[PDB]
């Protein structure tokens, strides 16, 4: 359609503008996202049993629930935790790509089909179920400016207005919170109770009694008495509110008409629900909001910040909102690069053109031949399931260069003729496109055999390769047409010839020479081939050696202005202790890392692999990039050194680290032959310990066994005294673990009413006696009258894999290369273990095929879809190999590049060479092309033809490179904002594009010539 679209400009122009306008809208319809949904969505059933423990819960909830899920679709692997607190978290993973919605709705039922069995306490608290996504899109926390806020009031206040306020923005998420919505707490006390001959029961009872909305029909309703004119509903006892009323409750009345109020037996006050998680902000009393999600991810974020004013004024004592962790800026500070890039590249290209076409009156062509495309590109992005994110952004950026390419590759030859044949603007531009024509197609369709192929990949990896692949295919599309229907068109309108100063426009002369030297050269070198061919292989060898000498990384350890640090104390460590050791942590940053560490969200009692009042985590928010100069002032080290500083911090383990730079090794043991935790914990012993004798310079993820307190209620003695084995159990757990009695509205909101004996009477074993139960006889009884103690070990957290008792391990072999061996030890190593003990792979480990472990599979493929695609050029076979061969060159370039740079074979890199190879293929084509043409298009002239071509085609090749190789220098240097990725990419192609032009040209006239001499030999 070029020779066709070239005589009708407007229809052309117009068909480009359309594509443009395809963006004016495309941009919009698009959800900006930090990252491509890169994980198996996964349902995660949360449960709780107030005051239980790792034993009951494990067997009375996790079990009644893991066992009652016999039939579900896509159950990839059923993980499991079981905190000693009641907490239960069956996470259910699903094959990357399922109906997150039905994949979960498909479950819940099987939960109902079993929950009627759960302990009353557990049902009641409420079983939960969710999906787990990018964790906390941005974590806002609240703090008191005016030192008037309690560790709990900010959670409370947050709990009534904010938490549910979450969705003030345009769009919102699944889970969020910290702190504890207030709760009517009736801390009790054994001595008084025994005095008044009272039991916790009476209390718990006295609550459900004198405090509970009641239904009381109405006067003159339903089947009235004919003739009734008034109709009003009756109102009886209601819920309670005043923290006082509760206190004013009525427990008993003796012989002197005197009464005993709940007050008289327990301190009643407005407290929180649970006291296990205390949080601090720069050590200032504070609570936050776990906004685990929330659409234009970028825009939502910015709106919770807009909603912010709705509470500045609100509440007299400070309450300044701060945003400790926000994974947002990484977008503005990404969308930018793309632009900056496109901008710098579009400008950068403009200039080159001048030093080559020296005509401004035709330097514009490309400046249209680029946006137009990157626009339509945006379009074909919403075309499918793709989101404007960092990943699909590079492609844009990356492809940019390539996108550009076609431009000149279309404007030079279309102008080359302008001097060669001295023919007229319009008449020339046809013939011009009368050759790069097919070339252009195959060339393009060929790359689709190197980006697309890669798209279709594994499960997680591919989740990017395609977010990549098409992102470039898409851009490679608009490429041809826009370069075939708009360029040929935009070129045929503006331009002016001749069949032939000084100043800086002598340049051309300097160039001409180098053209000549090239022509004079290649020709001579051709004559004696073999000499150069044997050199080719040496390289081929080198590349390889070089290649296998380069490491393998998933994605960089991209620097993100965020970083976690953990705190694990010894079994038994009271809250206090975990805090004492947290405070130090918090210090160091604010103390010795002043210049960067903006803050430190600390939370006592909450670790990712451990929980209770032994764990702890700190959210460190470093000062932005432009304010941390050198490398040593960056995360990698800030983290490196801090952990080092901590070391000497005896009796608790601590450390920090940068964030994965994408949201995400692990080895599972099993209790299969029916053994037990103890035996099963006895084996993970032998293993974790043994594995430890092959390392250079492997760990369990759970917590280890904690001391526990056994009671053993002596029934006989119990009955001999006449005490209900019930009043007992209740009068115990009740006062030691806390019961969820009624509910009560607190300032217009429903809340809980918990009862638990105040601390004073439950800190020590002995204190058990303290508690007196009531016997039918009507006379109090000590526990001690029928209880005995004894200590034994137990297990803080407890776990099971697939309804089976199991323990997780974190075996890491970080050489970088070949982990498929790191696993082999384990599976056999532990094969020497007892009976029942099996193994399996969880988490990241179960996702067998990663990027690089499968990369070799799809690559050899394009060696099919490209060889294949390229053969379609008239008569291919016998010839194809030449373009093919050109590939190793640019390859040993990108390689040396990432090698020297001390870089690893990362995804963006695994991406790179492809680009390059595309180019390595690119130029070659445009040479063997005219080469093929000449030899057939007209009189036969092998050697005399190829040179002739190797000439005509040099100016372009060189041209492009100056551009591309300039629209990439940007990324390779930078390590200030994001950029690690921008490092592997950039460095990836320069090293390629260089060794892909100087070295890659000379050989094509060689490869091609020898591939041709390979025909007349039969």
């Amino acid at each position: 359609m070029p020779n066709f679209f070239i005589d009708r400009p407007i229809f052309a122009w117009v068909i480009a503008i359309i594509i443009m306008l395809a963006g004016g809208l495309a941009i919009l319809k698009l959800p900006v996202a930090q990252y491509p949904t890169i994980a198996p969505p996964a349902v995660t059933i949360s449960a709780s049993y107030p005051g239980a423990d790792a034993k009951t819960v494990q067997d009375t909830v996790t079990q009644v629930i893991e066992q009652n899920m016999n039939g579900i679709d896509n159950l990839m692997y059923m993980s499991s935790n079981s905190d000693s607190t009641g907490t239960v978290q069956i996470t259910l993973t699903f094959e990357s790509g399922t109906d997150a919605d039905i994949a979960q709705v498909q479950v819940q039922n099987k939960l109902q089909l079993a929950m009627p069995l759960l302990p009353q306490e557990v049902q009641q608290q409420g079983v939960s179920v969710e999906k787990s996504s990018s964790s906390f899109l941005m974590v806002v926390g609240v703090i008191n400016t005016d030192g008037t806020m309690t560790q709990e009031d900010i959670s409370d206040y947050v709990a009534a207005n904010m938490k549910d306020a979450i969705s003030r923005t345009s769009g919102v998420g699944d889970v969020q919170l910290f702190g504890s919505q207030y709760a009517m707490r009736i801390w009790m006390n054994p001595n008084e109770l025994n005095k008044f001959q009272l039991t916790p029961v009476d209390v718990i009872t006295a609550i459900k009694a004198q405090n509970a909305q009641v239904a009381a029909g109405q006067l003159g309703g339903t089947p009235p008495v004919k003739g009734q004119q008034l109709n009003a509903s009756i109102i009886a006892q209601t819920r309670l509110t005043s923290t006082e009323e509760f206190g004013k409750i009525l427990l008993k009345v003796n012989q002197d008409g005197s009464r005993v109020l709940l007050r008289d037996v327990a301190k009643i006050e407005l407290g929180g629900e649970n006291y296990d998680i205390i949080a601090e902000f720069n050590g200032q009393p504070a609570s936050g909001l776990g906004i685990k999600l929330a659409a234009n991810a970028l825009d939502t974020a910015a709106a919770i910040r807009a909603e912010l004013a709705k509470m500045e004024p609100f509440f007299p004592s400070g309450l300044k909102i701060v945003y400790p962790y926000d994974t947002t800026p990484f977008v503005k500070i990404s969308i930018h690069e793309v632009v900056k890039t496109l901008v710098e590249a579009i400008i950068l290209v403009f200039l080159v053109m001048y030093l080559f076409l020296q005509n401004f009156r035709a330097t514009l062509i490309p400046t249209i031949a680029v946006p137009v495309v990157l626009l339509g590109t945006f379009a074909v992005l919403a075309a499918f399931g793709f989101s404007i994110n960092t990943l699909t952004m590079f492609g844009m950026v990356l492809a940019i260069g390539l996108l550009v390419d076609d431009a000149i590759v279309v404007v030079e030859n279309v102008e080359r003729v302008m001097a060669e044949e001295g023919l007229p603007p319009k008449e020339a531009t046809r013939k011009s496109m009368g050759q790069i024509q097919g070339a252009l197609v195959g060339i393009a369709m060929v790359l689709s055999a190197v980006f697309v192929p890669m798209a279709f990949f594994g499960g997680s990896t591919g989740a990017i390769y395609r977010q990549f692949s098409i992102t470039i295919v898409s851009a490679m599309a608009l490429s041809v047409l826009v370069a075939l229907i708009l360029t040929p068109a935009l070129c045929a309108t503006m331009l002016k010839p001749i069949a032939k100063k000084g100043f800086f426009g002598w340049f051309n002369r300097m160039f001409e020479k180098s053209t000549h030297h090239y022509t004079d050269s290649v020709g001579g070198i051709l004559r004696s081939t073999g000499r150069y061919l044997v050199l080719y292989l040496i390289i081929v060898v080198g590349m390889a050696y070089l290649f296998v000498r380069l490491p393998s990384s998933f994605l960089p350890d991209e620097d993100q202005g965020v970083f976690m640090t953990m705190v694990q104390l010894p079994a038994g460590a009271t809250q206090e202790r975990t805090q004492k050791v947290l405070n130090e942590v918090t210090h160091y940053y604010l103390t010795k890392e002043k210049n960067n560490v903006e803050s430190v969200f600390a939370v006592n009692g909450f670790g990712f692999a451990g929980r209770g009042q032994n764990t702890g985590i700190a959210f460190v928010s470093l000062k932005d990039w432009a304010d941390r100069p050198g490398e040593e002032n960056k995360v990698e080290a800030i983290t490196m050194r801090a952990t080092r500083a901590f070391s000497q911090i005896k009796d608790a383990m601590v450390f920090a680290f940068n964030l994965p730079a994408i949201v995400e090794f692990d080895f599972e043991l099993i209790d299969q032959a029916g053994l037990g935790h103890e035996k099963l914990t006895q084996a993970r012993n032998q293993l974790l310990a043994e594995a430890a004798k092959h390392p250079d310079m492997v760990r369990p993820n759970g917590l280890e066994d904690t001391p526990q307190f056994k009671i053993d209620i002596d029934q006989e003695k119990a009955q001999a005294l006449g005490v209900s084995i019930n009043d007992i159990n209740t009068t115990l757990g009740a006062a030691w673990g806390g019961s969820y009695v009624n509910d009560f509205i607190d300032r217009g909101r429903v809340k809980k009413v918990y009862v638990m004996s105040e601390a004073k009477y439950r800190m020590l074993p002995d204190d058990i006696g303290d508690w007196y139960v009531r016997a039918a006889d009507g006379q109090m009884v000590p526990f001690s009258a029928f209880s005995s103690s004894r200590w034994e070990y137990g297990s803080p957290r407890l776990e099971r894999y697939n309804g089976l008792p199991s323990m997780e391990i974190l075996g890491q072999a970080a050489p970088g290369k070949s982990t498929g061996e790191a696993m082999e030890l384990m599976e056999q190593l532990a094969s020497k273990l007892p009976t029942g003990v099996g193994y399996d792979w969880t988490g990241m480990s179960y996702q067998e095929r990663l990027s690089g472990n499968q990369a070799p599979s799809l690559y050899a493929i394009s060696l099919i879809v490209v060889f294949l695609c390229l053969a379609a050029l008239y008569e291919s076979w016998s010839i194809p190999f030449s373009v093919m061969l050109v590939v190793p060159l640019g390859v040993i370039g990108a390689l040396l590049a990432a090698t020297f740079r001390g870089l690893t074979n990362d995804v963006y890199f695994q991406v790179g060479l492809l680009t390059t190879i595309g180019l390595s293929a690119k130029n070659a084509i445009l040479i063997v092309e005219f080469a093929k043409d000449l030899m057939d298009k007209e009189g036969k002239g092998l050697i005399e033809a190829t040179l002739d071509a190797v000439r005509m085609r040099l100016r372009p090749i060189l041209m492009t490179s100056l551009a591309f190789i300039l629209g990439v220098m940007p990324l390779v240097i930078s390590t200030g904002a994001g950029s690690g990725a921008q490092n592997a990419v950039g460095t990836g192609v320069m090293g390629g594009m260089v060794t892909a032009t100087v070295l890659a040209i000379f050989f094509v006239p060689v490869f091609f010539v020898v591939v041709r001499r390979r025909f007349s030999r039969k």
Binding site: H517, Y518, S521, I965, V998
Partner: protein, 37 residues
């Protein structure tokens, strides 16, 4: 920001100092072609 005056300049300067650096690397790998002897 208005840094086009310090960026566009980096261009005029960049191009030249980078092109010949490409041309040069293509003149030596051109002469080392003495492998005709």
């Amino acid at each position: 920001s208005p840094m086009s005056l310090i960026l566009m300049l980096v261009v005029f300067g960049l191009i030249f100092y980078f092109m010949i650096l490409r041309p040069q690397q293509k003149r030596t790998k051109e002469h080392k072609k003495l492998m005709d002897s």
